[PDB]
Design a protein around this ligand. Structure first.
Ligand SMILES: [Mg+2]
Length: 821
RNA sequence: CACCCGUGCAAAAAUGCAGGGGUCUAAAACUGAGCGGAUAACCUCU
RNA sequence: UAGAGAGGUGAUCCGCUCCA
């Protein structure tokens, strides 16, 4: 987008009165080129200048890079920020005017630079991205007890990693009713039949059958996630602030359960790596009659699992496809062992390429990089494939004829006695040499879907890589960086980055218990509305697996009867897919086809039936999107809970936060609540004394003040409780009963929230504005665009977040829209 | 097609044109060759 | 016609490596 980024300007920093500029290095690193003080620059990195300064002035800098095509761009001097037309230049502050307090929190003192603030913001992003997935996981585990649904202070809410299971059992005989209820809730949870849906966490094999873990292990696994959620979404006090970063100091039981949970996939991958692929290696060694067997298994492990030496610069799969084309191996007879044949051929190609065919690989990579046209690309691929086939014709023939039918049985029954000394060097690390943070993260992802698992892992690696790059460039300048005593967890950022990269290689979705199949047939029976085939068809479906985890089957069955909701969601379906779906089971235009398909979906009944796939697909996508929309407000509430304490440390009289969470935006504005109402009216003088730069502008200050008078503490409290507990989705079958016409997922989610709020506040007196909002909601049969900004006011101090979270069209990145007024 | 900031030309104190922002939001990076993961769709054999 | 598995293919989102 920006021409400055294209020109190669990575970042612009300002320390003291001197300004440094960085450019992109190898990977995600950084390096200094230009330093400018008092419009006078001295070059650095003489060996390879990414860009050069055409002209220098106090206003800005002129650069022309060589990253790609010669592109000229102009960058702005950060020292002149906030000091325009308004001794008149200084290091820029934070938009929230909360920089010195954060710098004092994570470091000894203020550093008067603009790098540490970026590092702190990147650190905060870790908690910000952990909150959403932690609350999603805790919702997934809380989905149990669906039949006897109740809403109160839940068992998972009050879980802390202070008392072990030894002390927890003491509540069994205690006369205290409050603790008796908690212990009974835990006992009821431990006997739930649906626990098998997370067999990768609560189940362990025992000589062999999968069996339920011991009680203390289960309690530890539950309470770890519970405490993680409570710490990340709430605000701690005392020594519990630094729980995640002083994770090294738990009790023994949690360490043991983390070790046993994380070790099982490693044992299944590494310990029996020989046995799983024995039929392949035993013939590969025959093919390589003059190589070391230990080196061969080492190379096979490197290729198949870690892919450490892969990515040489061409698709080996395409090379194999072009090499085998036109030969007899495409025939149907070899289809039984076809996958093993491709694996052997690919490994042979790789091994030949890494050892001897190095110059050829380099030439192929250079030729691929030098050209752009696809015709030349495929011609070069075929040219290399012909030579490769000519060289390797005999070996693949040897592999193919040695992998026929009963010969595999003879291969399997025989034993093998390889030496494991050379192989263990490249083994992935066991649980004995793995940090607690990665173990806890892995335990967290046992309750997430594939998309969520990938997003979490990738964002974590990206953030840690950014932290490492900032640490390195901080080292380059020569300033102090050493963290405080209680925040030393980030000192070894490189170790955690490499560890997470290793973890990402083998992380997979949680496997499902074999014995749970009986429960599947009854649950899938109810999700199709067949009350007192399907098991063979839809149980294995991934949509069913990701729908049963995050939703009550009965509520999902009931919520599909709402015709407009189903009608809207299938609009995003590509034309070809729905066109195929329609004529598949129905026996003139796209819109009527969609409407008829939605009507057929709504009235699904039983007593050619390929319609089931579309129903599960649409249920899965709409539920996932509704969950994702709610995830944003969890982030906002977590940010509020952090910012109230940060501002209190800053010196502002924020006051109590839990009783009324509008206190944050009230303290920033300089207005104080009096006798239940905001007495003061708007005045321009109040804008100049805003606690942060966001509320300095008069118009948005007045808008926030006007909207604040229509907010109520009880409504905001209930909205907060609904957001954290996800009660809007948990009671979808009632809150979506009488919708008329939805226009986007934002509107659907907010209508759900409105209906929930109206349902609960039906028997309590309320002030006039809320009554007017309720009257508007019921008559229009759609979400009100004023209540949405009325109860979203606690995030008012962050004006940008306010606008994004209350204006339809500014909320979704993929669906831009117009702005009001 | 949101927010903030700088510069040059208009001032009636507020607009236009042209740029930057990991220190704004779920939110910093153009092209080419590849790796991994996740959800799909199509074809061929059983 | 609708119901198993394997292989391949045109498209999507996130991360990562190399060169310009
Ligand atoms: Mg940021």
């Amino acid at each position: 987008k920006s021409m400055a980024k294209a020109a190669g300007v990575k970042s612009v920093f300002a320390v003291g009165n001197t300004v440094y500029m960085t450019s992109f290095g190898r990977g995600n690193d950084a390096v200094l080129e230009q330093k400018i003080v008092d419009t006078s620059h001295e070059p650095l990195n003489i060996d390879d200048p990414a860009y050069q300064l055409n002209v220098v002035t106090m206003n800005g800098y002129s650069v022309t890079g060589h990253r790609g095509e010669t592109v000229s761009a102009v960058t702005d001097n950060p020292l002149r920020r906030f000091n325009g037309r308004k001794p008149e230049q200084s290091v820029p502050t934070d938009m929230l005017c909360l920089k010195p307090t954060l710098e004092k929190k994570f470091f000894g003192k203020e550093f008067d630079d603009n790098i540490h603030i970026q590092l702190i913001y990147n650190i905060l992003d870790i908690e910000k991205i952990l909150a959403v997935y932690s609350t999603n996981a805790i919702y997934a585990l809380n989905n149990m007890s669906a039949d006897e649904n109740i809403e109160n202070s839940d068992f998972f809410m009050k879980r802390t990693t202070d008392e072990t299971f030894d002390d927890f059992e003491k509540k069994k005989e205690s006369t205290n009713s409050r603790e008796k209820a908690d212990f009974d809730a835990f006992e009821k949870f431990i006997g739930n039949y649906r626990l098998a849906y997370f067999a990768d966490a609560f189940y362990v094999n025992k000589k062999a059958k999968n069996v339920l873990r011991e009680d203390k292990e289960l309690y530890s696994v539950l309470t770890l996630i519970g405490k993680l959620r409570h710490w990340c979404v709430h605000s701690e006090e005392g020594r519990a602030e630094f729980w995640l970063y002083k994770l090294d100091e738990l009790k023994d039981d949690f360490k043991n359960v983390l070790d046993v949970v994380y070790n099982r996939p490693v044992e299944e991958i590494n310990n029996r790596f020989i046995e799983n692929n024995k039929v392949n290696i035993q013939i590969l060694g025959s093919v390589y009659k003059n190589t070391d067997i230990a080196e061969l298994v080492r190379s096979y492990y490197e290729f198949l699992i870690t892919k450490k030496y892969k990515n040489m610069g061409f698709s080996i799969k395409k090379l194999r496809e072009s090499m085998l084309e036109g030969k007899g191996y495409a025939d149907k007879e070899y289809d039984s062992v076809r996958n093993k044949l491709y694996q052997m051929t690919d490994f042979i190609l790789y091994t030949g390429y890494i050892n001897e065919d190095s110059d050829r690989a380099d030439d192929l990579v250079n030729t691929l990089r030098s050209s752009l046209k696809e015709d030349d690309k495929t011609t070069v691929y075929c040219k290399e494939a012909d030579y490769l086939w000519k060289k390797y014709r005999e070996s693949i023939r040897e592999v193919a004829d040695a992998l026929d039918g009963d010969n595999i049985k003879k291969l399997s029954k025989s034993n093998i006695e390889i030496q494991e000394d050379k192989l263990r060097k490249c083994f992935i690390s066991y649980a004995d040499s793995v940090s607690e943070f990665t173990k806890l993260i892995y335990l967290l992802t046992r309750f997430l879907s594939g998309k969520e698992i990938n997003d979490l892992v990738t964002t974590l690696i990206n953030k840690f890589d950014n932290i490492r790059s900032f640490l390195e460039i901080m080292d380059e300048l020569g300033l102090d960086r050493t963290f405080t005593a209680e925040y030393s967890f980030f000192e070894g950022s490189t170790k955690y980055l490499a560890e997470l990269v290793e973890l990402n290689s083998f992380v997979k979705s949680c496997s499902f218990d074999i014995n749970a199949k009986r429960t599947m047939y009854r649950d899938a029976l109810d999700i199709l509305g067949i009350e007192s085939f399907i098991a063979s068809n839809v149980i294995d479906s991934n949509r069913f697996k990701y729908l049963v985890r995050y939703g009550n089957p009965k509520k999902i069955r009931e919520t599909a009867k709402c015709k407009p909701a189903v009608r809207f969601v299938l609009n995003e379906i590509p034309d070809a897919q729905i066109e195929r779906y329609y004529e598949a089971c129905c026996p003139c235009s796209a819109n009527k086809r969609r409407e008829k398909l939605a009507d057929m979906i709504a009235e699904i009944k039983f007593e050619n039936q390929a319609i089931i796939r579309l129903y599960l697909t649409v249920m899965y996508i709409m539920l996932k999107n509704l969950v994702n929309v709610n995830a944003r407000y969890v982030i906002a509430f977590h940010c509020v809970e952090r910012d109230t304490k940060l501002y209190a440390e800053s010196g502002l009289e924020v006051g109590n936060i839990e009783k009324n969470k509008t206190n944050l935006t009230m303290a920033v504005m300089g207005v104080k609540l009096e006798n239940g109402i905001i007495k003061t009216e708007f005045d321009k003088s109040f804008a100049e004394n805003a606690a942060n730069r966001y509320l300095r502008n008069a118009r948005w200050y007045k808008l926030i003040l006007d909207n604040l008078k229509k907010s109520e503490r009880a409504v905001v409290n209930e909205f907060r409780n609904t957001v954290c507990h996800l009660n809007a989705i948990r009671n979808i079958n009632i809150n979506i009963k009488e919708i008329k016409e939805v226009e986007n997922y934002f509107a659907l989610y907010h209508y759900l929230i409105q209906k929930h709020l109206e349902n609960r506040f039906a028997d309590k007196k309320v002030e006039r504005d809320t009554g007017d909002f309720i009257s508007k909601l019921e008559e229009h049969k759609t979400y009100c665009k004023d209540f949405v900004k009325a109860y979203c006011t606690p995030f008012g101090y962050n004006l940008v977040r306010y606008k994004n979270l209350t204006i339809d069209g500014l909320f979704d990145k993929n669906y831009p829209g117009k702005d009001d007024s």
